[PDB]
Structure 1
């Protein structure tokens, strides 16, 4: 959100759920941010270098967080043949 002169009058551009695209509210304490380490070719975790996902408290409350991470990680290559698109 910006004014006529172009300044970003918006404070706090919020985060969005990786699964449902909902805005993660300031007091949504059931929402989490999963951080998964990147692994180099030696099998070592690269320090301070992560794949990050955010889940709203709605998804976590419904129990869909596990299946959503399975899908998101499989699409990002973090997993192989664990999540299936067709049920």
Structure 2
């Protein structure tokens, strides 16, 4: 992770699932990433979006929909809707 100099030593920093926090392996082909766009007061897509990542485990469980719905309800509060 961090050397005594203070530099990176691993090749890359992985993503971790936004629901179960477990990391996403480079060979996890069931892991997906959704960008949810935001709108304006009239209802116009403004080109910016909120990004979530789901690991293969949570998807195969079948709790991907509930976890993503809960994440969106929680996250939209800070940035309005």
What runs of 5+ residues in structure 2 fail to find an aligned partner? none
Deviation sequence 1:27-52 (CA, Å, 0-9, x none)? 100000011001112210112x1111
- Structure 2 match to 1:37: 37
Q: What SS class does the counterpart of residue 74 from structure 1 fall into? A: helix
Distance 1:61 1:35 in 2: 20
Per the TM alignment, residue 7 of structure 1 is displaced from its structure 2 partner at its CA by 1.4
More displaced stretch, 60-69 vs 2-11: 2-11
Q: What SS class does the counterpart of residue 50 from structure 1 fall into? A: strand
Q: What SS class does the counterpart of residue 77 from structure 1 fall into? A: helix
- TM-score for the superposition, normalised by structure 2: 0.89
Q: Which has the higher helix share?
A: 2
- Structure 1 match to 2:59: 60
Per the TM alignment, residue 10 of structure 1 is displaced from its structure 2 partner at its CA by 2.2
- TM-score for the superposition, normalised by structure 1: 0.83
- Structure 2 match to 1:77: 76
Higher relative contact order (CA 8 A, sep 6+): 2
